[model samples]
Each structure stands twice: as C-alpha cells, then as structure tokens.
Target: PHGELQYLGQIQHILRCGVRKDDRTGTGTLSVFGMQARYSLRDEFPLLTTKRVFWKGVLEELLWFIKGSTNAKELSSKGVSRDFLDSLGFSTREEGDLGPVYGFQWRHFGAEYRDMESDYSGQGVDQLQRVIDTIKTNPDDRRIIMCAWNPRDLPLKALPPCHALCQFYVVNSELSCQLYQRSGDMGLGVPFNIASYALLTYMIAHITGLKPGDFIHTLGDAHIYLNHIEPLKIQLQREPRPFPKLRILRKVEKIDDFKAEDFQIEGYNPHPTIKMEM
Candidate 1:
C-alpha cells in the first residue's frame, strides 16, 4: 500500500514542481531532479496496483538479461515482436540485434566488442556470478554490486542503459537491493522498473538462502512525459490494492537456471491498464 502510494505521490510532486524540458523523443517532459522510494519485498511483491503491469514481459525480460543476451530477438520471441522492435527504432544490423546492453554488461562486463553471437564464456568479469558468490562466502562484503553502465561500451550500444548500477546488501540474513537509475520515465518505465528490480532481489535472495528485504530505488532525472499528465492524473485518483505474494515454485540453485514458469504472482488485483506513450 505504501509503495503504490509513494509512487502516486511522486507523480503528484512532479506535476506540481517539475520543470519543463525537451528530450530526444521531442515529447517534452515535466522533469524532476532526484527521487527515491522504498518498496518492501518481505513476503510481498511490489507490482504497482494502480496500473496493471505486464508480468509476463517483466519476467521474460529479466530472464533474458540473466542469459547475457544482447540480441533483441531473444527477448522479442518471449514478448516483443520484430515489427515492434523496428517501430521502436531498435532495428540496426540484423532483425533483433540490440548491441551490448543490460545482459552483456551484467554477465560479461569488460568483454571484447564482437557480434551478439560471439562466444564470451571466459571473457569479461562475470559480475553477476561474483555477486552471488560474494553473498554466499562473505555476506558482509561492501562491494556486492552489479553495474551495467559501462563507459567503454556506450558507443556500441543500441540504447544506453537507463536502469544502471544496482548494489545488494546483506543484513541479518535479509538481502536488500538498491538501484541507481540514471533516468526514469515515471509514467511508464519507473513502475516496470520497480517490479523488475524487486523481482531480481527476490530471485537473488532465493538463490542465496536469504529473505528478501526492501528495494530502494534512487533516480536521477526522474520525469513525467508531458503527454502522460492527463493519464497520470486519472491514475492518481485510483486506489491501490494490497500487493500480491510472489511464490517461487522451483528450487532454483543458480540465477541463470530460473525459467518463467518457476515464479508465480498470487493475489494481484490491479486497476485497468492506463495508456501512456513510450
């Protein structure tokens, strides 16, 4: 309840005090500077009850990232279609090649810049694996971080990472995640990101044998698109229902071994979907 209310309040704050600014899409935004919100993951998932989030897309997208796939077709097959990717300006070389983005950075940080099909098994620093191992061996380690904002790979990316560096903390057998996103579209993307990272924390907690804690989201350049004002106003008027409980069905020992069927979200009764431009 507090999580969705906090998100709604964030929207209200932006509409009231955000400055006008133009972006790459030419759809100007009511922009705000820094913002932070905490969502509890202790026995409940924060899947924003104000608007129905595409749970399938969220799960599939995260699984694709864990697979270290830079190819958009891999993700598109799960949800987004080829035509959709083309329409979204993600069409570059091949039909579904989205250069080195999230997955590539997560699994292979400093790997050589080859094609998406290149073998990067033993190439770069495997930050995801390192984080898991660190949590198991030394839970008190301060460096348990996975960063996707690689400065060297910026030029080669189809799109720069929006949700950038994420750090994990272990306290009293509880694991908490803090995501530092460079930019957030508070209307659409932020809600998806809230659930995405929260799910990630739960998955990591499951594999590491720790209870899930809070998801602290820190954003820089948090904004609401000018076009999304009216829809957000309507959304803010809606009431938030109790959050759903996430049940991990299988005993997933490794992070990469998780499938879409391995997770289940129960008791989610969100409002109807709100239309907002990407």
Candidate 2:
C-alpha cells in the first residue's frame, strides 16, 4: 500500500462515502471519486497500473510546462507528440494559444505583486529556478510558490487552469512539493500529474544540490467523470504489482536544457492497459 495502491485506496474510500448515485450525466452514470495524496515515499516512482504511461512523454511535458510555452509548435519542434495538446483542443492553427495554462502563468503571471497593480509586466518570475534556489540557499522559506492561475490571462487562455498552483517547501531537511489543482480529470490526468510533479521535484533536486522530497497533491475539485467510474473500478480490482523505477538516462544540469531523448524508464511491468472513458 506504499505506492499507487495508497492513492487507489484513498480514492475508493472517498467514492464509497462522498459520492451519491445520481443521473447527473443524463446517461444513468454515477460515480464516487476524488482525493489527494501527499507523496512522501520517495523510495519508488508512482505510475498507474491502469495504463501504459509514456515516461518520456511525461518528462517532455514537464519541460514544456516549465518553458511556459502554450503552443504545440515548440514541442513539435522538439519531437514531443501533439496528442496531449490535441486532446486539450490545441490545433496547428491554434498553437501558442494556451494563455494561462502552465508556462504562461508560471513564468509570466501578469500582475506585479500578489494583490497589487494589475498592469504589472515583468518577466513574471522563474518559479522553477526560484524553488530550486530556495531549497539550496534558503531551505527555511516555506513560500516557494509556483502558480498557474492568472485571472487576467484566464479569458485569453484556450482553457482555464486546472492544475492551478503548487508550492515547494522543506521539513527536517527533506524537500516537499504541494500542489493545488482547481479541477482534475482524475481518471486520465491525475496519474500523469502525480508523476510529472514528482519528477519535477526529483529533477529540481538533481540540479539544485538537494535531495528528492515528498510530493503532496491538494485538490479543489478532484472528481472522476461519471462515465469513467466503471472502468476505474475495474482498474482498482486488479492487484497492484511492484512500483516501477524511473531512470533519467543522462545527467541534466538545467531545466531548460532537458530533452525528450535524455530520459528513460526501466522495470515497468504492469497489467494490460485498460481503456478509460475519457
């Protein structure tokens, strides 16, 4: 129960209690799901058994998010697939349209101060580097924050921010990252989100001269779409095997320099993939 099972168990518990059977989806669909996990167990990597995760894709996506590019063009140029972008309605013509998603809101979140002048335009801030620096130079600051929410940029964005914000801090000299996701498509996105951020923590630690830390996920509206419940339940019934080990093929010194070809995953033996109702 230390790896993915922990998340699976907690989500099941929430569903059985908080979710009420209803015809909300108008398709006789009913679901009970949504919970957050504070991933303190860094001894293993957390990948979902229900699906075959493209570990390379996850790493590329994280780097893409850190670069703060909303378009698929850059990612395409770097050999990253357009599938996830397409899933989010990103098209060739609509490339660079992720207004306030990951990179835009993280690096250049309009406003100057937290609650100050609205017309503020600085290079936003290098949130990822700042967190790493904090972990290295000032581990005591509990305010290592990275935000994906910008009310001003939300309207211009193709989609409103789902994974709204994240903050990194340390306790007992161990690194920890806490994420606040406004809305999560648990069945499809949560697993990737967990893996991505955990890898982020690991990568940041790698460069900033710190150790890998806990990954804490906090949710605002985390729920499985009613259509996805049955498939998820089927996934839950299968016994979870041993957690997989993530291996970065080469050493990456900086976040911006990471490439899709520079990472790898080994020992990922899981059950056959289950098609979800996404």
Candidate 3:
C-alpha cells in the first residue's frame, strides 16, 4: 500500500541510512528496495510526491533513450537534459560520439551485422507500446522484455547505460514490471526511474484492459553522491501528496503507433518545488 509519498520516504531512508561510498568504483552503494505488500494499478500511480518531478520530461527522456540516440542535438532541441550533451561536446552535424549509450545500443546494436549502417540500424521501437500489447495479447508470457544496455554499443557511448534494462511478467492476470538498472544516481536518477517505470506500468494497464500491478526496481549500483546528503535531509521533512492520475489523449491500438502527444496527467497537486544541488 505504498503511495508516492511513502515511496519517496523509503528511498530517502535508504539514502540516509543504507548507502555507503566505494572508492574503487567511484560510485555509491544501494540497498535493495522491493514491494512490502502487493499493490494494484487500479488503486494509484506511483510517482514521487516528495518533489515536483517533471512527468513530461521523464516520458520524453525515456522515449529519447529508447530511441537509442546519443546525439544531444535532438533532446537538447526539445529542452531535454543538456548535461550529457554538454559533457560530450556534441553538435548537430557531428552527432558527437557518445560511445555505446542507451539509444545507439538498444536500436542499432551490432550483434548481427558488421557495417554501421547495415549491421546496426533499426528504427526506434515503441517499448511502452510493446508492454501494453503483451499485457493484452499474451498476459501469460514470462519473457516480456525491454533492454537498455547493449554491450556491443558501450565502446561508442560517452557513458555506459545506467538504467540498463527491464522485464515485465503477468501473474494471475495482474501485469507487473521489473526494472534492472545497472547503475542509479540516488539523488537524481533513481526517483525519475521509479516514476517513469511505474507510470509505464499504469499506462500499459489502461490500454491492455488489465489492472496495474507492482513495480519491482532492481539496481546494481544505487548511490547518493556525498555532496547531496544535506539537501536530501531537508526534503525528508516535506509531506507527500496523493498519486496523480495519468490520462492518454487517444487510445492507440498498437505500441509503435503511439506518439508523445497521446498522453496527459490530471489532478496532480504537490508540495512546493525543492531546490537541490544537481
């Protein structure tokens, strides 16, 4: 029975008490967090209520990453995060080399082919749509998979994929999702990942004519950067609001046919935005 607020609180507690730094990996450590009790998608959406998260941004970023584009030009043009782009020094014409980033690997992974164009070029596949379709068409398939990390593409990306991959399963007709994130920046990335995938589960339920189920987030390296501890404590004091409802504009029959304009959120109320060091 965890809402967004309780979700945020549990994460905050993990950050405050569960994490420890490892000098060897240059990353923080994370404690495993899972569902204490089962939850249904019909009851609520599991976005964080502790902060003012840009739900639109989360959606766009997920789409962009799944599109497997390493070039900052596309996302930057749409006001998506410029941090990765600026770090890589990318330009439109150059399409900066981001060495095996999520986009390049997921879409154009070079496992089958040898040439860059012929060996590894596939158009963006709508991952969200596939999950929905699976829920509707094959609710019993255990191998409903979505991958973010393509080892073959790692050499080309600026940074290796962090929120690496996910899988969905149907049990007793309830559709549940499990995220396998290789790395998670607790202060910034973890919350977004949680919200994004949880929202994904809810959306899949709506179109599949099934109930939403639990979100199981599995992380490899989930950590809070040492610099973020103080601000995190302050955020812990805030109250979390009710989970907001998400409404897609028009129901699309297929995953590949879905577009960014097809979704909307209704009745979202939250605490004041908290400024934190990024």
Better of 1 and 3 by lDDT: 1
For residues 19-116, could you state the per-residue lDDT of candidate 2 as single tens digits?
A: 54444234432234445776653666776655666666687777887776666566666665233344343343364454344565666654233221
Report the Cα lDDT for candidate 2.
0.65
lDDT per residue for candidate 1 within 182-219, as digits (tens), equals 88999888999889999999999999999999999999
lDDT tens digits, residue span 221-253, model 3 = 556666667777777787767767767688665
Candidate 1 overall lDDT versus native: 0.86
CA lDDT, candidate 1, residue 89: 41
Each prediction's RMSD over C-alphas, in Å, is 3.6, 6.1, 4.9
C-alpha positional error of residue 109 in candidate 2 after TM-score superposition, expressed in Å: 2.1
Predictions in order: lDDT: 0.86, 0.65, 0.61
TM-score against native, each model: 0.91, 0.77, 0.74
Best by lDDT: 1
**Model 3 regions more than 4 Å off:** 23-40, 81-93, 96-100, 111-137, 150-153, 156-163, 206-209
